[PDB]
Design a binder for these strands. Structure first.
Lengths: 91, 98
DNA sequence: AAATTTGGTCATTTCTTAACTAAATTT
DNA sequence: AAATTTAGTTAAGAAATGACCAAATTT
């Protein structure tokens, strides 16, 4: 049912799959703890940068550098994909 | 002075290591693993939406966790997320968060 | 009873897009 | 040498934005 997931180990050394979203939650839950109450700023543009980069990396690995195929595979116009690569200096 | 915290470490999930020692790793890495695993299952099946797919998995939690923080306050949420109040509303409607 | 937030339109921008190139590159 | 990819242009369609406001609410 659930396609984007990550392996997790438990007390009894049983590896078991968990939805990526569950990690994203934890990641923040922690981030908020760290902050006492220091107003947050561009949390979106932060999380994006944190997700886009792994994603771009992987499809530009799975398509072995093929931007034309990479774009197709993600559903975004090639030119957009170029903009993002440029945006993290992945070109 | 203050020690450096690289953007990688600003958002982190905890993991057990080789020596059964708990430690934070960047969120990036969870995202990598999730795709590395997602491809492995794919086996030549073709993909088209992978961005939206990823985005939807990530946005839900963010909206979710921010709205708990601001205790339902949209004006606050959208401000600390750094987006328009109107789009935050749009996204929230999209993910059935009402 | 003030102050804030919600919800909702509206105009301007800014971003994404397909549709086309000619060049470089893979096949 | 033909087919595919790249690195661009364009235009035009879509998404995001701040600025409003009137109502609902929270202080």
């Amino acid at each position: 049912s659930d396609v984007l997931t990550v392996s997790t180990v438990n007390s009894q050394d049983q590896v078991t799959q968990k939805p990526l979203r569950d990690s994203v939650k934890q990641a923040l839950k922690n981030y908020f703890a760290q902050l006492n109450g220091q107003d947050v700023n561009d949390l979106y543009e932060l999380v994006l940068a944190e997700v886009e980069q792994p994603l771009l990396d992987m499809v530009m690995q799975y398509t072995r550098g093929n931007q034309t195929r990479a774009a197709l595979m993600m559903g975004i116009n090639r030119g957009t994909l170029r903009k993002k690569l440029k945006k993290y200096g992945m070109n």
